Amino acid sequence: PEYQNIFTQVQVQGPAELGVDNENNLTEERTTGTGFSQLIGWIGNAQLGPIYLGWFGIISLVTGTLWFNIVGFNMLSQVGYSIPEFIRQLFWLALEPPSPEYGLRMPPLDDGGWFIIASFFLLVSVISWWLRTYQLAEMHKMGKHVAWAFAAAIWLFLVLGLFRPILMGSWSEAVPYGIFPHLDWTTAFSIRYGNLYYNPFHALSIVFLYGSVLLFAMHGATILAVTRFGGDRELEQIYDRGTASERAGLFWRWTMGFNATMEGIHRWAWWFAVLTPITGGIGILLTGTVVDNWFLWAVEHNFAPDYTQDYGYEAYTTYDGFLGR
Amino acid sequence: KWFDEWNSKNPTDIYKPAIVVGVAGGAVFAAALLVSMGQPLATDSMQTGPR
Amino acid sequence: GHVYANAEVGVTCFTCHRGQAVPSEVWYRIDPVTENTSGWASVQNRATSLSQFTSLPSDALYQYLLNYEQIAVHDLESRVETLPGDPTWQNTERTYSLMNYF
Amino acid sequence: MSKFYKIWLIFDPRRVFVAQGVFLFLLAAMIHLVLLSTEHFNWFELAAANA
Amino acid sequence: MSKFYKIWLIFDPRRVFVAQGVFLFLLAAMIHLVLLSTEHFNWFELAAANA
């Protein structure tokens, strides 16, 4: 068949690209040293490095390492410092939030103090990383879209861990640090407050998540299908329209009756992705503080379905009949 | 004695058989494997609520 | 009302015992399952013989089926005034462990 | 019936014979497998054992 | 008004005709279906009861 442009047929390699610079003097803080990986060169660029070292990046790295080490050493001490049993039960361990009886007060190290210290370090690390992503775009003389979309996810992060426990008045409302233990928190949160399906903001969040995955499938396929016209060079197509953009627009116009531009599709993508954590955080913040049972709320607002048939197995079959006796 | 027909008029012999072969050998036979992979373990279900 | 729920089904010795002096599936109290922990952190985060392959609390069957603690956790109105002492998501996890056992 | 030979004035024999051979095989194999998958016709019942 | 014919100097008749056809059919189907959701005006059920 025709070439489909999924893996590159042949690779070429030249001198390493050290990057652009301006009066801001970015070269001062950049590391020296690059590598080439031929395995990842089949799908994308092969060059590895260099990287930018600032104050925000170093602070974020140190605080994140501290948070990781605190969680890990607590998990190790919880098992008796036995390494084989630490490995055997890795997915089941966690560092647990404090008990409900302490409110917002500082608990003992045995019953949530380490949890609070680790949470403080993680918060510092994430905020420092956001500051770094803002500063880099400021020094490159570009727009601030990356920082604003990272801030939309940080909103749901903060609502889950900081704002809602303060509004409810207890640090015991936060999420435990563990793999199976945080999936237990998700299910228990859904059960405790009725049914999270009947939360309209959870439904809006699902709408936007599904839509973003659908949009990425569409955009990736469309750009790969017009690459024979040089379609992957999107910026030059924005500055000087070519036949790739026209064919890409006309496909969707003839398919569903309307289309986009080469620059306008990225606005659609940016909004569908960012709208997911915003609606999610609004939905989470309203639970427990305003609404305590979402199914009863749905019954009150008349969008809960009604069923006529009966419940129980004896209305449909017999115990002997199921067993085959 | 007709070698003056083949050498004079040449195409591709193996193109249509490759179609037949990628149709049955391909689709039909593999379908069998996939169905006969999960269905050998039959299951029965008991209803406890409305349809 | 329980053993004769649908038909005549009693209990004899050969219902818990099945030829053994000690019947199978008997349980003990194991509540402190991790070390260096004090409260809600002391009962759950471990795969034990009482937790049903999950990391849910191993405290159940001792507060519910031996002691008398409330199992229900739900609110019975769409909007209620939350008070301290009301059920939390940890009580919900304990009930979830009991229902897994059921 | 007497004029059935004019088929070779429509279809090229070279590309027909290879496809026909590719079809007759992949028919016989399917029939043999269908016979094997049954109990009464599996002949690996008198086989798979030596006294 | 005798000047109503000037609506065709603003709207294209080709698009208005299509829109009108779709609208009229959908409205008729909607009314016919609303009648059948009642007990007094469902003619199938009335036919069944009268026998």
Added chain:
Amino acid sequence: MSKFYKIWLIFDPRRVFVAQGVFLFLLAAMIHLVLLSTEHFNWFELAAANA
């Protein structure tokens, strides 16, 4: 009413005919299926019960 022939100066028959062909068959299938979901007018079940 005597000038209704002028619709063909507005619409090309090539699109109109395919539109009408889709619409009429859709209508027929819908009506037959609606009749088949009642008790009084389901002829397949009436034939069985009458025997």
Added chain:
Amino acid sequence: MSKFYKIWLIFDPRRVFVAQGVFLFLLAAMIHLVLLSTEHFNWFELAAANA
């Protein structure tokens, strides 16, 4: 009625014949299957029951 032959001045017969064949075969298969889905008109079960 005597001028119905002018339908072939609107639509190409080469394209009409293929579509008509597809439509007729699909309709025949659908009706046969609908008959097979009942009890009174399933001739595979009737043969088993009668003899």
Added chain:
Amino acid sequence: ALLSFERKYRVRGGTLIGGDLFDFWVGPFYVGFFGVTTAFFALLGTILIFWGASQQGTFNPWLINIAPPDLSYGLGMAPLMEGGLWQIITICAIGAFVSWALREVEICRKLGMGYHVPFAFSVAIFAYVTLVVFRPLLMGAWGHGFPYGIWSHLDWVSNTGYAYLHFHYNPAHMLAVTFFFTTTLALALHGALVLSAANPPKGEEVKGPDNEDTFFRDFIGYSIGTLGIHRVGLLLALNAGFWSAVCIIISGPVWTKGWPEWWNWWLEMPIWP
């Protein structure tokens, strides 16, 4: 009405079947053989849904519910008012989806493009068919499919998840959820980077691909390129769909107990003391 550059692309030819019997446009929409079939199937399905709604007793969009038959009917046909309508609508929907994909193929052929979009849509079609055809066929009853209602098809998901107790412990569900989250994150980053290149602060010149490559190597130390990002996004979305289908198809016919129990192979390996 046409776009300013559209007329030179509207040529004749490139059809799988039909020729010029259906080769035209209606407004912006292209019509073909598969356009005709799509219209028929979609209209019949919608009208049948509304007939079922009228016979149910409610026209409320939140409350309409058309359900599959009981489990005692097996793989046979049910009465139309007790589950047969759902089966007819399912057949119509499958026909409509396949017709939509083939119409997309015809449009791709006429425009001279690759066939990536119909191939990507085929995976979503495959997930739907797994939900309504393959799993009920393996489980032995058409009544295992989800109902057609805006709020009643969430109750099906809830009850099916809680029938394996704790569904978060399904490993294939874990893989699918991870792929979904990663796809969304990648889409956000890609849109942001392109917009930031094309829309600098006021009074500044626009940027180029070198600038984008430099921002991401400074940011995280690696850049995937303007061609690799589209491949990666397509692959992530397709993997999400495929693993969703796998996770649902293993829950009924292959595993019967609760999902936490599956990890007993890890918890009891001989290598542990």
Added chain:
Amino acid sequence: EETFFGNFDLASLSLWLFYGFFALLIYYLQTENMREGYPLEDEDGNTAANQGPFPLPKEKTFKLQHGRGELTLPGEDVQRRDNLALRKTAHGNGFPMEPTGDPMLDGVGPASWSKRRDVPELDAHGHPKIVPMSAAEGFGVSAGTDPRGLPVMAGDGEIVGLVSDMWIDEAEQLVRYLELELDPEWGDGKRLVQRQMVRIKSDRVKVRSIYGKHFKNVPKTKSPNQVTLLEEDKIMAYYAGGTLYADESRLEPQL
């Protein structure tokens, strides 16, 4: 919690506010995507009587690099073609157009090109972005099969020449074009093929879109060291038009 009236609480107010916001956002997003290709026209070239539900956006300005000036959109369609060898097949709207002469040589249908600028695309240094490999310092093949010297196979199975060079993108380290040297029996000079329409094997290079007799009419570059945007559009459109116009069986129904 209490209700203002009826069942109206904070959740309902938040929901209605989100509904209003989403309506405004949908309007903005649809309007931002109408900066190219408007207003609409009919099949005869005149402005259409219908223009839609959404009004046209206001103007925005770009500032280009390397002293190319400004770009304000929406504006006049500067990428428009002048004389198209096309004919109408109906007196109304909604029907296809028919080529007048040779669609592959006239650039219509899937062989269409857009009128881009007659200058090469530049990198950050201000040099032409795409360069032949013979004039790139320190570049070489690092993986895969090197296609230089291998023969080129046409779509009908004819050998037309040999691969003589590759044109690479220095900034992004990627191969963009393959350069061929035509045999005297199949034309004269050198031609370019985009990397996205070829398959490199161990002994040959295969091009399936066009036939052997179509290789002499591929558009040529003006200079042996660079290519402009117009030239690229004209070359890639030519190669893509063959997927429909190379053979009569590729255009008629497949059934």
Added chain:
Amino acid sequence: DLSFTGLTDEQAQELHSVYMSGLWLFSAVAVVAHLATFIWRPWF
């Protein structure tokens, strides 16, 4: 003279005559159907 569609005054009058005739025929059929239905099952 104002015209968005390119039509003329006389053309618009001629089109409107036939359109109104079709409307009146449709309305007459609907009136007869409504009267028959009212005699069959009154709703007032």
Added chain:
Amino acid sequence: DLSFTGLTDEQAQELHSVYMSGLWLFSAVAVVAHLATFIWRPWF
């Protein structure tokens, strides 16, 4: 005269004549079918 399709008056008259000839035959067949069905199983 107004003509979006390019047809003349006589061509439109011929086409309408044949079209109505088809319509009336379809309607007569449907009327016969409806009468037979009503005799078999009335709905009024």
Added chain:
Amino acid sequence: DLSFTGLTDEQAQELHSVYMSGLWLFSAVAVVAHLATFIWRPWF
């Protein structure tokens, strides 16, 4: 005369004759089949 397919009047008449012949033969076969089926197992 109006023609979109390129056929003439005589060719259209000649084609329609054979098409009608095929349609009538198909209908006759279907009628015989329906009669036999009704005799075997009557609906209505």
Added chain:
Amino acid sequence: DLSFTGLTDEQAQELHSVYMSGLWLFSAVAVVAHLATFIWRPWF
């Protein structure tokens, strides 16, 4: 005198005369195999 393959009437006849014998030999072998297998285990 059609020839979509470049053969002449006599050459096609000679080719068919060999094809038929090749088919009949396969038929005879299959008949004997089916007789043997039916003797092993009848299916009618």
